[PDB]
């Protein structure tokens, strides 16, 4: 069976090579480059006693949520810096958090293999407990459905009102670290500790395509605004842009001065800029088309753990291990 | 405005939470399955001389532990339990200790090393490593046990000098002085952290 697998792998590689006639860099040679982008810190949010592990912007572009090591899930009002909510967790090993699109529910989870869902109307409303490994990322499809990825090499689609695993996605050979939902909310992607990202159909429940060009574990993933591409960041100090229709890697964002992996990846509203949070205590803003570093965001005393971009693209929120969350404009 | 009042109340609650959080010492318990880590996620909270210790033992995830270990970066110490009786699996424990010591995110965490089941080792010695033949016991208190201790200390002092320390201990299955040793090691770790801060290291 191994020989057949190698045969289809060679056929896939040959088809991909034949399909690729030009390169993105060659096409993006006659366009004007983005000028030196210098984004300044407008707000800083304090109150977390320990390192911040994840964050998620609200769909109203104003409120956000952040989870820290001290077992605290704090919901901030970004505009006035005033704190809105503070939820204590049963376990202080939270690795991810999420904000419901309607703004009524907030989910988190971690080393306890439990996806806790709190109702903001703050009492815990549901505990989804079906995973075998740590839960690494959870995203909200609706107030009744959620998609999670665990460290047991599986993803899941849960129905919240019942508490059961409606669908399970298998195929990863390593711990799944991050996932991103397409804007159509019908397809999504998952990056694992396997140097391979995969595309899952939510309704069908079967993997459509697998993109493997990386060299080490993938720590973060984000989806292009138009829904036909996505960028992944890994531990080999590189970011990569993959295209859905061509099913091949398009551009590689890296410089010969970085020896640290990427812990967070996000796009701008128009997709022209790609923001990558690094373990070197700073973030980099790349030109997503010219593959040239257009700017650097510095000011964190520890590694940037989470990075997000506002829905309307008016701000970028970065949370690092320095127990501080900074908003850049 | 009521929002500012709510923010002030939450800030006071967070100050109280910081006050309680800073007084609890968190420890991570690691070791192989054969090593008697239980006898020394399951969370065990104990109290030594009015000091609160909280030890977490993680055994619910898979064997790939290069990703969830990073969640224990700010832990006070790693209590590493080694079954010194079993010679066959000793090299596996040595590899685990070396990987823990040389890790980038755990390069500033001290290791309290317990060498469990000394009675079994003593029984086995009285009626794998070729280097044991050309070995002599040091001028310490009261040969195989000290050889294993030196084998661990070789890796301990091979790298990371001045950043963290390894504290060996010889523990039996019915030894009740483990809490005192953990408290003393934590006290020395706090003293070292204070010294490093005071010299701007």
């Amino acid at each position, epitope marked *: 069976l191994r020989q057949e697998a190698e045969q289809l792998k060679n056929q896939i590689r040959d088809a991909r090579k034949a399909c690729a006639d030009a390169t993105l860099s060659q096409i993006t040679n006659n366009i004007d480059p983005v000028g030196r982008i210098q984004m300044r810190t407008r707000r800083t949010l304090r109150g977390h006693l320990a390192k911040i592990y994840a964050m998620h912007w609200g769909t109203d572009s104003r409120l956000l949520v952040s989870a820290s090591q001290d077992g605290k899930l704090i919901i901030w009002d970004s505009y006035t810096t005033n704190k809105v909510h503070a939820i204590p967790l049963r376990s202080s090993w939270v690795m991810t958090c999420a904000y419901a699109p309607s703004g009524n529910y907030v989910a988190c989870g971690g080393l306890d293999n439990i996806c806790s869902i709190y109702n903001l109307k703050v009492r815990v409303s549901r505990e989804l407990a079906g995973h075998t490994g740590y839960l690494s990322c959870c995203r909200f499809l609706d107030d009744n459905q959620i998609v999670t990825s665990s460290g047991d090499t599986t993803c899941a689609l849960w129905d919240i009102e019942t508490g059961q695993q409606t669908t399970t996605f298998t195929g990863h050979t390593g711990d799944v670290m991050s996932l991103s939902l397409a804007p159509d909310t019908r397809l999504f992607v998952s990056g694992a500790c396997d140097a391979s990202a995969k595309l899952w159909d939510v309704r069908e429940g079967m993997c459509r395509q697998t993109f493997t060009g990386h060299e080490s574990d993938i720590n973060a993933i984000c989806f292009f605004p138009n829904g036909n591409a996505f960028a992944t960041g890994s531990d080999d100090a590189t970011c990569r842009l993959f295209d859905l229709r061509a099913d091949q890697e398009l551009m590689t964002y890296s410089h010969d001065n970085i020896i640290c992996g990427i812990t967070s990846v996000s796009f701008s509203k128009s997709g022209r800029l790609l923001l990558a949070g690094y373990d070197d205590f700073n973030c980099n803003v790349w030109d997503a088309l010219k593959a040239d570093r257009a700017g650097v965001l510095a000011g964190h005393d520890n590694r940037v753990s989470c990075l997000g971009v506002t829905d309307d693209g008016m701000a970028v929120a970065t949370g690092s291990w320095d127990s501080f969350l900074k908003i850049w404009n | 405005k009521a929002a500012v009042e709510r923010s002030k109340m939450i800030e006071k609650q967070l100050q109280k939470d910081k006050q309680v959080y800073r007084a609890t010492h968190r420890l991570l318990l690691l070791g192989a399955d054969n090593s008697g880590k239980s006898t020394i996620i399951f969370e065990t909270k104990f109290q030594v001389d009015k000091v609160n210790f909280h030890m977490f033992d993680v055994g619910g995830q898979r064997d790939e532990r290069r990703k969830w270990i990073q969640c224990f970066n700010d832990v006070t110490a790693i209590i590493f339990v080694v079954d010194s009786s079993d010679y066959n699996r000793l090299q596996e424990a040595l590899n685990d200790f070396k990987s823990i010591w040389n*890790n980038r995110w755990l390069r500033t965490i001290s290791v309290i090393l317990f060498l469990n089941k000394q009675d079994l080792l003593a029984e086995k010695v009285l009626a794998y490593f070729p280097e044991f033949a050309r070995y002599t016991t040091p001028e310490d208190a009261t040969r195989a046990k000290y050889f294993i201790r030196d084998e661990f200390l070789r890796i301990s002092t091979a790298s990371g000098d001045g950043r963290h320390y390894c504290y060996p201990h010889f523990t039996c299955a019915v030894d009740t002085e483990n809490a005192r040793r953990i408290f003393n090691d934590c006290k020395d770790i706090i003293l070292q952290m204070n010294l490093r801060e005071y010299n701007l290291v």
Partner: nanobody
Framework: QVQLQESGGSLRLSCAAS????????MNWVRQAPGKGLEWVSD????????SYTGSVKGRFTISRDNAKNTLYLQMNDTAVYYC?????????????????????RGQGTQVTV
């Protein structure tokens, strides 16, 4: 695609690597004896620096790496299935999950019978 193809099976076991920059990772040779679990055997750094061997093979085995040809050699002179494994991340002097049941960056391995 991270590919590690092993060959061979005194012996001169070889491991050819492709899909990544070879001279950037710390490599290990691992074995699995029949009826037992995975056991680490040998380890070499990324530049021919300090080399580690398990207690039972010290001196008796040799391990080299040809960075120009992107290959890893293990010269031996027990019966087991051998694999060549890579450190998960580059520029790092430690391998964490090499001796694991399911490792993503480990080759197929070759049988050696004595």
């Amino acid at each position: 695609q991270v590919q590690l193809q092993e060959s061979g099976g005194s012996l001169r076991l070889s491991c050819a690597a492709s899909g990544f920059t070879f001279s950037n990772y710390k490599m290990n040779w691992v074995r699995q004896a029949p009826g037992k679990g995975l056991e680490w055997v040998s380890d070499i750094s990324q530049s021919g620096a300090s080399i580690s061997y398990t207690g039972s093979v010290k001196g008796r085995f040799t391990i080299s790496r040809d960075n120009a040809k992107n290959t890893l050699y293990l010269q031996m002179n027990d019966t087991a299935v051998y694999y060549c494994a890579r450190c998960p991340a580059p520029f790092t002097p430690f391998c964490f999950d090499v001796t694991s049941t399911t490792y993503a960056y480990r080759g197929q391995g070759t049988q050696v019978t004595v």
